[PDB]
Each structure stands twice: as structure tokens, then as C-alpha cells.
Design a protein around this ligand. Structure first.
Ligand SMILES: [Zn+2]
Ligand SMILES: [Zn+2]
Ligand SMILES: [Zn+2]
Lengths: 23, 143
């Protein structure tokens, strides 16, 4: 489902970014 | 609600300038600058995925933000909250704001901005305050 897929993508890209800036 | 007001201003200005394509307290300016740097970077790095997400979502109009709200809520449904996810949400919000402009020149990006702000501020208010709000946001993504 599009909403779930979108959520998982945002969750994946967000965590990537978070790990990146977390120093 | 000062936190909401500040958040809405920051998020609105970014989406609007991203949509139109041009730029027109101190914390708000630093947050917008950070948002421009990180948010543009997220959009460039993940354009394909963002495009796919957008296509599947199939947003008809400016007022069609209910699906987006459900997506933002679900993102945090695992109980995990961090700045990375927050900035990625806002980045995707700007990506959507651009497309709406593609569909029509005259869309008010406000409904989209308020939709995003409500989820952040309403559902994560005490997290945001604990993180030092938008000052914490700026610090986290500092370079
Ligand atoms: Zn990335
Ligand atoms: Zn409207
Ligand atoms: Zn409280």
C-alpha cells in the first residue's frame, strides 16, 4: 500500500540521515 | 502556542520557496538555512524514491493532505523519534509542494505545511522541547 511504502521510505531515509549527523 | 507558531513559520517558508523556486528570529533563520542545506540534499539524493512515493500517493490537489498525514503518523508508529526522520518528512513535504506547483501555479502551500506542523508539534511536542526545539534542530545538522 502506497502510504505504508512511503512511510517505510521516509523511515529509511530519515534513519540514514540521523546516523550520518549523529557525529 | 509559540512552538507551533515558530514551527509553522519555518516549515511554511521552506516549502513556499521550494515550490516557487525563489527566496523572498535568529533561530528561525538558522533553521531555515539548515533546512535549505539538508532538505535540498535529501531531495537530490533520493529523488527517485521521492518521485516513486509521490506517484503512488497520487496527490490530486493542495487540500489533499489526508493521505500525507496518515503517512507521517505511520512513520513514527514504531515509537522511534529523531531529527533525521523529521527533516526527511519536511524534505518530502517540499518535494510535494513543488509538484503541486507543476499541477497548478496558484496552490497555497499552507494546508500542506500546517498538515506537517500539526503532526510534529501535536504528537512530538514534549520530544521537541526536550531536544531544545529548533535550536536543537540546527545544532544536530551543524557542519
Ligand atoms: Zn541520503
Ligand atoms: Zn485550500
Ligand atoms: Zn507535556
Amino acid at each position: 500500500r502506497p502510504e505504508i511504502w512511503a512511510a517505510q521510505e521516509i523511515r529509511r531515509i530519515g534513519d540514514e540521515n540521523n546516523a550520518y549527523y549523529a557525529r | 502556542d509559540e512552538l507551533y507558531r515558530q514551527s509553522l513559520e519555518i516549515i511554511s517558508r521552506y516549502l513556499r520557496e521550494q515550490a516557487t523556486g525563489a527566496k523572498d528570529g535568529a533561530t528561525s533563520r538558522k533553521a531555515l538555512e539548515t533546512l535549505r542545506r539538508v532538505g535540498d540534499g535529501v531531495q537530490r539524493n533520493h529523488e527517485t524514491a521521492f518521485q516513486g512515493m509521490l506517484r503512488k500517493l497520487d496527490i490530486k490537489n493542495e487540500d489533499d493532505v489526508k493521505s500525507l498525514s496518515r503517512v507521517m503518523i505511520h512513520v513514527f508508529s514504531d515509537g522511534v523519534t529523531n531529527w533525521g526522520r523529521i527533516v526527511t518528512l519536511i524534505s518530502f513535504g517540499a518535494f510535494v509542494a513543488k509538484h503541486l506547483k507543476t499541477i497548478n501555479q496558484e496552490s497555497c502551500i499552507e494546508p500542506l505545511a500546517e498538515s506537517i506542523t500539526d503532526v510534529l508539534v501535536r504528537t512530538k511536542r514534549d520530544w521537541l522541547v526536550k531536544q531544545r526545539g529548533w535550536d536543537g534542530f540546527v545544532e544536530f545538522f551543524h557542519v
